Design a protein around this ligand. Structure first.
Ligand code: CLA
Ligand code: CLA
Ligand code: CLA
Ligand code: CLA
Ligand code: CLA
Ligand code: CLA
Ligand SMILES: CCCCCCCCCCCCCCCC(=O)OC[C@H](COP(=O)(O)OC[C@@H](O)CO)OC(=O)CCCCCCCCCCCCCCC
Ligand SMILES: CC1=C(C#C/C(C)=C/C=C/C(C)=C/C=C/C=C(C)/C=C/C=C(C)/C=C/[C@@]23O[C@]2(C)C[C@@H](O)CC3(C)C)C(C)(C)C[C@H](O)C1
Ligand SMILES: CC1=C(/C=C/C(C)=C/C=C/C(C)=C/C=C/C=C(C)/C=C/C=C(C)/C=C/C2=C(C)CCCC2(C)C)C(C)(C)CCC1
Ligand SMILES: CC1=C(/C=C/C(C)=C/C=C/C(C)=C/C=C/C=C(C)/C=C/C=C(C)/C=C/C2=C(C)CCCC2(C)C)C(C)(C)CCC1
Ligand SMILES: CC1=C(/C=C/C(C)=C/C=C/C(C)=C/C=C/C=C(C)/C=C/C=C(C)/C=C/C2=C(C)CCCC2(C)C)C(C)(C)CCC1
Ligand SMILES: CC1=C(C/C=C(\C)CCC[C@H](C)CCC[C@H](C)CCCC(C)C)C(=O)c2ccccc2C1=O
Lengths: 73, 33, 81, 30, 88, 733, 165, 176
């Protein structure tokens, strides 16, 4: 999860919006098209998700490390 | 041979970079040509 | 030399080949294919190739197979018109 | 086992090459 | 320069790699001299870059005189610090 | 003029520190220089290429000189298995006495670095034996570099500058750089191998002073002209041949033995000579294909225009590609970079499996270093190829000149390409990660018997087809009653089979479920990197978000927060994102190679076959386990020769982390901080005297992304190089 | 056309202004190479080759009194003379070439004006009439172009068959 | 002349350095000549000291502990005390040189040409002959000293003898 967060932290919204455009073309070609148009996460949401996953990954890594290092006793 | 490194390493790592950075600093902000 | 339609202009075959009538190219291509296949089969298929079995004639014949393909394509191009 | 003369002539040829590099760069002409 | 030369021998003398050798003070003095030379190079290049188109200190000649004075005073300060520390 | 960067008036007038930074990053973009024309562009590129060749040759001469002057090459050639090759001395005044004593190895009498380049094995194989030979080679290379520098200067003179038509003479360039640069060069190299390398390997000293009177073969060109070329294959070196001595030596100079030399566990020199002779012949013949003011030959424009299938499935075919390729430097640069990257990958893949250099494959550290080095360079070259293709689309593509062209039809159905690439990437990633996590979970619960271990049937089948009689497939060369084996039985099959079926080799390493999963991970990495790069290249000219992207150039920060936000929308941003995936996939490949080879070298390959099916195995048995000799380079108890590698390991970690600083935190925060810094400096006595000449501003958005990526890459490479070298050299595996 | 080769068109780039011109270039190199520099290089090769031929021929019968100057073949001679003398002559030639440098790469001067000139010889040439100037230039070009092949054959014969004859 | 053409070529190539006096300029010639004259004096003094053993002689090598890792040559070897002594005799002059280069005496000749001024006219093959403490005498002696250094070094390198021993061979073999 910590490594996964870097995907949101480093990248920007435009790339993902264009990739979603291509995927939406693929869906439309088969007459599958959600009425709720897909959108790449807003810039602020991209940062928030990256930070949340970064914190979860770090906290969980240290959580497991400490608990397994101090429960083998 | 066995004397050169003492002479050159200081020149290549101190004197050469020092003079090079001095000249580059002079040229970057020369304000003419 | 960009061409549309179903058959390229003869000028694609080059100055020499473009003047050869289709039947001549067809017979030449058949002869070349036969010789090349026969050479490739005589050495390394019907007979194992060794250090002292390298026949220049068979090497030339084997090289003649792509010439056979080119000549058969050229024969078709000449045939369409 | 390269003698000091060999090192010195290598240094001389390197200096000549360095001067040529100086001139080439100058001629690229910023 | 006098202020900053006397000031600079001490750190090299007492915390340099040769601090524990009987030649610590001389190594510190030499390090201070080298650093002073570097700083005077810095001053000269700064003067030649900043003020290019005797007076207030913000001029080519004014800054050149300031730098010469700084070098002389810094070497004086380093030498005086060495002299003082040599017997203490 | 008027400031530092002449080639940019806009940057010259910039009053901030940006002027400096961009002045460095726009130097080599000759196209954008003010008052630049096509002819001057080509001539400047030509001179720059001369300079680069001079740099390469000086680098090589430096390597030769340092090995000759400070190396132990003679001691090494005497006993090449037990002594360690020397790179250069270490004159570091910062060393302490224990460090000087610790880094004294090999020949000794001075601190020294043990060379891991493998240049010792290469030079020994090509026939060099004494420091005098290395010194002469270095002097020759220095003279050659001086000559190239002079030529670069000369071809900038008004009367020697080649005209523009000269550069775009594609036919002659191809003819000469095929028959001459590749073929004649290969002919000369095989001549060297026949005249020097082979006799030197058989104990006979051939040099400039006697190579004109001692023919490489006793018959001496009589069989060559008479047609009895078989003479040159007779009497090869018997298996009981001590390399470098006449003990069990032969006389053949052109053979097709195959396999490996038993004593050196490398390729036969005569096989290399015959190989290069054949390659030279083929290239020389190939170079006579295009016409150059001699009537005969092909005209490539006609070839390209003529290949348009009548079925119409390719539209206008290749019409108009000749003009685009010849007029665009970026397209041909990308093609060359891609081909070079494929070749670099091929060298990495083939040197380890087919050892060309005597006594290599026993110097494990050199092999690992070479493989990792060339794979990383291949990744860089591929990313560069795609980046320059995106640049070509941005500033060199002409949609009117490529109407209904094959290249235009590439953009016509770009959505399909990108969507199917995305599907393949998602499929591979989802399922490979799922299998890895499934194995991790089942093994974690003490039930390893539930793992999904998939046997790589197809790869093992290929190995069997080449003669691997270990999987019991009985197909092609693995079955005696097959046309392939019988046809090849006489020439090279015996040696090749003896080499492949022997497990003391890297030829077709035995593979299992771990190899299967890692290969699918590699496929995921390649497909995802290609997805990123192809999306960048194809959307470089515009998207629904920026239908006029081509007007903003190749590298621009964004298009503002409008209509949803457009961070990292330019093609340069696609390259920047793809660099991370390139690094990740090359890291996967190098981890796989290194761990498999380490387990094989240790003598317990079962460890990999067991622990490579779940990720915890990779984290424990490869990273945690093999880093012990590295992190112990220096401890409170003392230090050893690996201390430098441990320091570089920590340094790479630090640089990698520092890259995150530029990749996560963006400009506005830093600009607002520099505002306060400027205020503080301006309001300080005794410091108001000193004032900046260039106004200090935060790094630009694109510059910041580039610097973060550069730190990321430098740290990544340094840390992995330190790990791969130190672990292998500390455990000799 | 092409006096030298009857069956090839006269090469387009070259025209009679260059002494020794007979329209010989069959490869059409004249259209790609700086003809001023090519002419200067050819003239330098002519003069060096003529000097080498005369030197090897004179040396083949008599020598300087010293024994180490008594080598009979050119290759044995270069092998026998001490390194000091070779370095001395090389230094002389290097000084002359360095002096020639700046003038060689100009473009507003002829080939004869590029290579360093003996002041007496240059003055004699200047005092000469234009027709006689061209006549002497052609004489030099042709004698030297013979001497080049002469010296190449001389050295190859010496290396292969022992003696240059 | 050829020398004039070379100087003009240098001026065109590197106008800034030539303007400041760096490169083939008469100020550089005078400075190098003065340095070479002092250098001949110092080589004579070094020979005399070697003869009389004033230098601590190569028998003694500096201790690593006292003089640190700078004294280290290669690995275990350390710079000889004689080389150190000569280096220090040179360091005195180098410190003097920095002092006088950045803080020149008002009447002293500056190291570099003043911004306004330009380099003095070229002396020529034979500088104007005038005795006494006159600029021409100084320049002539500097040229002579530099040429002498060059050719004595050439002698020592070609024959292989040490430079000091080559100097000894000259004179009347007074020194060593
Ligand atoms: C026979 C004639 C000839 C020859 C030898 C060359 C040679 C060269 N040309 Mg020239 N050129 C020619 C004719 C020729 N050209 C003609 C007729 C034209 C007019 C159209 C040009 C126009 C031209 C231009 C405009 C430019 C060149 C350039 C170059 C250089 C390419 C860079 C390089 O180093 O090559 C690389 C050489 C190799 C042998 C590498 C081969 C590549 C393979 C993949 C490598 C594999 C080798 C091996 C397996 C690896 C193991 C080796 C390892 C152990 C060390 C090269 C020196 C470029 C340059 O740099 O100029 C200085 C350049 O810009 N040429
Ligand atoms: C690119 C090739 C290369 C490289 C990386 C090195 C690297 C090194 N050399 Mg070696 N060297 C080389 C070529 C090279 N050398 C060649 C061709 C010669 C023959 C003249 C030498 C002769 C030499 C001696 C005699 C000594 C070294 C020493 C050293 C070390 C300290 C650096 C130093 O003092 O340089 C000194 C080097 C020079 C004065 C000559 C310059 C070296 C090359 C030719 C410059 C190449 C520049 C390159 C193309 C990039 C230019 C761009 C750059 C300005 C940013 C270092 C390990 C020292 C050592 O062993 O310390 C332990 C030492 O005493 N070098
Ligand atoms: C393969 C390497 C390479 C090559 C061939 C070039 C080629 C060029 N660059 Mg690029 N450049 C490079 C690397 C390279 N660069 C790198 C790494 C950077 C930093 C990111 C830049 C940044 C840069 C800028 C900012 C600019 C160029 C420019 C140029 C042009 C001419 C510059 C020149 O030589 O002027 C003359 C320079 C010199 C004569 C100096 C030569 C250096 C000498 C040889 C150093 C020798 C010192 C020696 C080692 C000392 C040892 C002493 C020891 C004993 C102590 C030319 C197109 C300019 C240009 O043309 O832009 C259009 C320009 O503006 N370059
Ligand atoms: C021989 C091949 C080749 C050639 C001729 C070029 C030439 C060019 N490229 Mg291409 N490129 C190449 C390979 C090549 N590139 C490869 C392999 C890649 C993949 C990484 C790229 C990726 C690429 C991109 C993404 C872009 C270019 C661009 C350009 C142009 C401008 C380059 C410039 O200004 O440099 C500026 C030079 C620098 C900023 C110097 C940076 C050097 C590196 C990053 C720092 C290294 C730090 C060092 C290792 C740290 C030391 C470690 C120590 C501390 C331990 C120029 C036409 C740009 C363009 O717009 O062209 C039109 C552009 O946007 N190129
Ligand atoms: C470990 C880190 C990591 C991971 C897993 C991914 C994963 C992915 N990246 Mg990203 N990326 C990363 C780091 C990472 N990236 C970084 C550091 C960068 C540099 C900025 C990028 C840059 C990047 C780009 C530019 C692109 C990708 C693409 C992809 C996809 C590749 C195809 C694939 O594997 O599909 C499989 C998907 C996965 C393996 C993701 C994990 C899915 C899990 C297993 C499902 C879990 C569901 C579960 C119920 C969640 C419950 C939550 C609940 C408890 C709250 C995938 C979504 C490409 C893409 O979008 O392809 C379509 C693409 O274009 N990435
Ligand atoms: C005009 C020039 C010239 C002249 C007059 C001769 C004349 C002669 N040559 Mg020489 N030769 C020449 C050019 C010349 N050669 C060149 C250019 C080559 C190189 C291809 C040779 C290579 C050559 C060889 C290898 C031999 C001769 C031999 C001979 C003799 C028969 C004869 C004396 C032969 C000889 O010495 O006769 C005994 C002999 O063996 N020549
Ligand atoms: C696995 C590929 C990886 C590399 C990427 C792809 C690059 C190469 C793309 C071409 C692949 C080969 C296509 C074969 C295409 C092929 O062989 O047919 C070629 C044919 C078109 O041929 P032409 O138009 O040249 O033929 C003219 C006709 O009038 C017949 O004379 O197309 C079809 O028959 C229908 C579509 C293919 C149906 C194939 C069924 C089997
Ligand atoms: C400091 C010191 C000492 C000292 C000292 C010093 C400073 C000594 C200095 C000596 C010095 C500085 C000696 C320079 C010679 C230059 C020569 C001979 C140049 C010839 C140049 C020639 C022949 C140039 C020829 C050309 O240019 C021509 C004519 C035209 C061009 O087209 C072609 C070329 C380029 C080829 C001690 C005591 C010795 C040691 C002690 O430790 C401390
Ligand atoms: C009190 C205090 C403080 C501060 C302090 C300080 C800051 C000090 C400083 C000090 C210093 C900063 C000092 C200095 C000194 C100096 C000196 C003392 C100098 C001297 C000099 C000299 C002596 C010189 C000489 C010379 C010269 C000029 C040159 C050469 C010659 C001679 C040698 C003669 C405070 C309040 C904060 C806090 C508490 C404590
Ligand atoms: C961006 C861009 C670009 C680029 C692109 C690229 C970069 C591509 C790549 C591509 C690639 C990178 C490709 C690859 C390929 C490969 C291949 C094609 C291979 C093949 C192989 C084969 C075909 C076969 C082989 C074999 C044989 C012979 C038989 C048996 C088997 C084997 C394997 C052995 C350009 C510049 C153009 C421009 C436009 C855009
Ligand atoms: C300041 C001083 C001083 C003074 C100094 C001086 C002034 C010096 C000088 C010096 C010098 C002044 C030196 C010189 C030298 C020289 C030489 C050493 C020479 C040589 C020569 C030669 C070698 C020659 C050769 C030749 C011949 C033989 C003939 C001619 C030609 C020729 C060239 C070939 C005193 C004492 C007070 C003290 C302190 C310091
Ligand atoms: C990947 C990525 C996307 C694309 C990501 C998207 C569209 C999120 C997709 C979420 C899916 C559709 C929901 C299901 C996800 C999991 C299966 C479980 C739910 C997780 C939480 C939502 C509860 C951005 O839009 C983006 C924008 C700005 C900066 C960085 C990025 C960025 O990195």
């Amino acid at each position: 999860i910590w490594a996964f967060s870097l995907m949101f932290l480093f990248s920007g919204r435009g790339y993902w919006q264009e990739l979603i455009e291509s995927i939406v073309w693929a869906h439309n070609k088969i007459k599958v098209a959600p009425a709720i148009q897909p959108r790449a996460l807003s810039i602020t949401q991209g940062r928030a998700v990256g930070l949340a996953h970064y914190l979860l990954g770090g906290i969980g890594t240290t959580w497991a490390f400490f608990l397994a290092r101090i429960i083998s006793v | 041979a066995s004397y050169l490194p003492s002479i050159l390493v200081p020149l290549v790592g101190i004197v050469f970079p020092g003079v090079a950075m001095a000249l580059l600093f002079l040229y970057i902000e020369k304000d003419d040509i | 030399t960009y061409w549309e339609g179903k058959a390229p202009p003869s000028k694609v075959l080059g100055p020499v080949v473009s003047q050869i009538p289709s039947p001549a190219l067809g017979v030449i291509s058949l002869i070349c294919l036969g010789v090349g296949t026969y050479s490739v089969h005589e050495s390394n298929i019907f007979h194992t190739l060794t250090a002292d079995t390298i026949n220049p004639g068979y090497i030339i014949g084997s090289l003649l197979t792509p010439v056979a393909w080119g000549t058969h394509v050229a024969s078709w191009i000449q045939k369409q018109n | 086992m390269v003698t000091d003369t060999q090192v010195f002539i290598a240094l001389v040829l390197a200096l000549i090459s360095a001067l040529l590099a100086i001139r080439l760069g100058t001629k690229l002409y910023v | 320069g006098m202020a900053h030369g006397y000031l600079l021998v001490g750190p090299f003398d007492k915390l340099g790699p040769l601090r524990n050798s009987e030649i610590a003070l001389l190594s510190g003095f030499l390090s201070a001299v080298g650093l002073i030379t570097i700083l005077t190079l810095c001053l000269t290049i700064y003067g030649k870059v900043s003020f290019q188109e005797n007076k207030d200190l913000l001029t080519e000649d004014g800054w050149s005189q300031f730098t010469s004075g700084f070098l002389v005073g810094a070497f004086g300060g380093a030498g005086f610090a060495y002299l003082t520390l040599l017997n203490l | 003029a008027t400031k530092f960067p002449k080639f940019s008036q806009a940057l010259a007038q910039d009053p901030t520190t940006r002027r400096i930074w961009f002045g460095i990053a726009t130097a080599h973009d000759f196209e954008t220089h003010d008052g630049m024309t096509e002819e001057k562009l080509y001539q400047k590129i030509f001179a720059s290429h001369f300079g680069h060749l001079a740099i390469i040759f000086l680098w090589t001469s430096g390597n030769l000189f340092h090995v000759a002057w400070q190396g132990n090459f003679e001691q090494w050639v005497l006993n090449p298995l037990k002594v360690k090759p020397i790179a250069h001395t270490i004159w570091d005044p910062h060393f302490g006495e224990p460090a000087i004593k610790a880094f004294t190895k090999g020949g000794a009498f001075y601190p020294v670095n043990i060379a891991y380049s493998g240049v010792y094995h290469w030079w020994y194989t090509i026939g060099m034996r004494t420091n005098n030979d290395l010194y002469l080679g270095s002097i020759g290379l220095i003279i050659l570099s001086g000559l190239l520098l002079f030529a670069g200067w000369l071809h900038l003179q008004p009367k020697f500058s080649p005209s523009l038509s000269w550069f775009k003479n594609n036919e002659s360039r191809l003819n000469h750089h095929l028959s001459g640069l590749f073929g004649v060069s290969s002919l000369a190299w095989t001549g060297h191998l026949v005249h020097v390398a082979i006799p030197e390997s058989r104990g006979t000293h051939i040099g400039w002073d006697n190579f004109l009177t001692t023919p490489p073969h006793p018959d001496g060109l009589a069989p060559f002209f008479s047609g009895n070329w078989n003479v040159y294959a007779q009497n090869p070196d018997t298996a009981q041949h001590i390399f470098g001595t006449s003990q069990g030596s032969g006389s053949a100079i052109l053979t097709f033995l195959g396999g490996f030399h038993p004593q050196t566990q490398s390729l036969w020199l005569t096989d290399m000579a015959h190989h290069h002779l054949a390659i030279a012949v083929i290239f020389i013949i190939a170079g006579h294909m295009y016409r150059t003011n001699f009537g005969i030959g092909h005209n490539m424009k006609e070839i390209l225009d003529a290949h348009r299938p009548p079925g119409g499935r390719l539209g206008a075919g290749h019409r108009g590609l000749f003009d685009t390729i010849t007029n665009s430097l970026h397209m041909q640069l990308g093609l060359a970079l891609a081909s070079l990257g494929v070749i670099t990958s091929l060298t990495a893949q083939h040197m380890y499996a087919i050892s060309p250099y005597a006594f290599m494959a026993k110097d494990f550290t050199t092999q690992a270093a070479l493989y990792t080095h060339h794979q990383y360079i291949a990744g860089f070259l591929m990313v560069g190829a795609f980046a320059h293709g995106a640049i070509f689309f941005v500033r060199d593509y002409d949609p009117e000149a490529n109407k209904n062209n094959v290249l235009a039809r590439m953009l016509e159905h770009k959505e399909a390409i990108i969507s199917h690439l995305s599907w393949v990437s998602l499929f591979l990633g989802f399922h490979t990660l799922g299998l890895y996590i499934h194995n991790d979970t089942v093994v974690a619960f003490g039930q390893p018997e539930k793992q999904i271990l998939v046997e790589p049937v197809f790869a093992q089948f290929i190995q069997a087809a080449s003669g691997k009689a270990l999987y019991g497939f009985d197909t092609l060369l693995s079955s005696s009653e097959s046309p392939a084996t019988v046809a090849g039985s006489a020439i090279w099959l015996p040696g090749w089979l003896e080499a492949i079926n022997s497990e003391k080799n890297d030829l077709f390493l035995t593979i299992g479920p771990g190899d299967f999963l890692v290969h699918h991970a590699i496929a995921l990495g390649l497909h995802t990197t290609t997805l990123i790069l192809v999306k960048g290249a194809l959307d470089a000219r515009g998207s629904k978000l920026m239908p006029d992207k081509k007007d903003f150039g190749y590298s621009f920060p964004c298009d503002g927060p409008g209509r949803g936000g457009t961070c990292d929308i330019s093609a340069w941003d696609a390259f920047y994102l793809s660099m991370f995936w390139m690094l990740n996939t090359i890291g996967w490949v190098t981890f796989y190679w290194h761990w498999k080879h380490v387990t094989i070298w240790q003598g317990n390959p079962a460890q990999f076959n067991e622990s490579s099916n779940y990720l915890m195995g990779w984290l424990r048995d490869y990273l945690w386990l093999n880093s012990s000799p590295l992190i112990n380079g220096y401890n409170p108890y003392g230090m050893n020769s690996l201390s430098v590698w441990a320091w570089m390991f920590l340094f790479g970690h630090l640089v990698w982390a520092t890259g995150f600083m530029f990749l996560i935190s963006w400009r506005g925060y830093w600009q607002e901080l520099i505002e306060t810094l400027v205020w503080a400096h301006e309001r300080t006595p005794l410091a108001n005297l000193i004032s900046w000449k260039d106004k200090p501003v935060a790094l630009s958005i694109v510059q910041a992304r580039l610097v973060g990526l550069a730190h990321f890459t430098v740290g990544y490479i340094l840390t992995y190089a330190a790990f791969v070298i130190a672990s292998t050299a500390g455990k000799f595996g | 056309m092409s006096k030298s080769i009857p069956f090839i068109q006269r090469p387009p780039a070259l025209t009679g202004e260059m002494p020794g011109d007979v329209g010989f270039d069959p490869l059409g190199m004249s259209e790609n190479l700086n003809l001023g520099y090519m002419q200067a290089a050819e003239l330098k090769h002519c003069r060096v080759a003529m000097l080498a031929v005369v030197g090897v021929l004179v040396t083949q019968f008599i020598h300087l009194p010293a024994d180490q100057f008594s080598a009979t073949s050119p290759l044995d001679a270069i092998a026998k003379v001490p390194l000091a003398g070779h370095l001395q002559i090389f230094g002389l030639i290097a000084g002359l070439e360095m002096g020639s440098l700046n003038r060689t790469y100009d473009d507003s001067t002829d080939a004869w004006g590029k290579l360093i000139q003996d002041p007496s010889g240059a003055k004699q040439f200047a005092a000469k009439s234009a027709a006689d100037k061209a006549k002497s230039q052609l004489q030099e070009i042709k004698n030297g172009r013979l001497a080049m092949i002469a010296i190449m054959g001389m050295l190859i014969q010496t290396a292969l068959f022992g003696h240059p004859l | 002349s050829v020398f004039t053409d070379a100087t003009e070529a240098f001026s065109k190539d590197y106008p800034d350095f030539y303007k400041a006096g760096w490169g083939p300029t008469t100020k550089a010639e005078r400075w190098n000549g003065r340095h070479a004259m002092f250098g001949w004096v110092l080589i004579v003094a070094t020979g005399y000291a070697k003869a009389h053993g004033l230098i601590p002689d190569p028998e003694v090598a500096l201790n690593l502990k006292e003089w640190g890792t700078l004294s280290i040559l290669a690995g275990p070897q350390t710079i000889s005390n004689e080389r150190a002594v000569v280096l220090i005799a040179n360091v005195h002059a180098l410190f003097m040189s920095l002092c006088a280069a950045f803080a020149p005496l008002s009447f002293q000749d500056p190291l570099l040409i003043p911004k306004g001024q330009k380099d003095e006219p070229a002396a020529g093959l034979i500088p104007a002959i005038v005795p006494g403490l006159t600029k021409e005498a100084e320049l002539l002696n500097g040229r002579l000293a530099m040429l002498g250094l060059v050719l004595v070094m050439g002698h020592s390198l070609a024959t292989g003898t040490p430079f000091l021993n080559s100097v000894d061979l000259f004179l009347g073999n007074r020194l060593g």
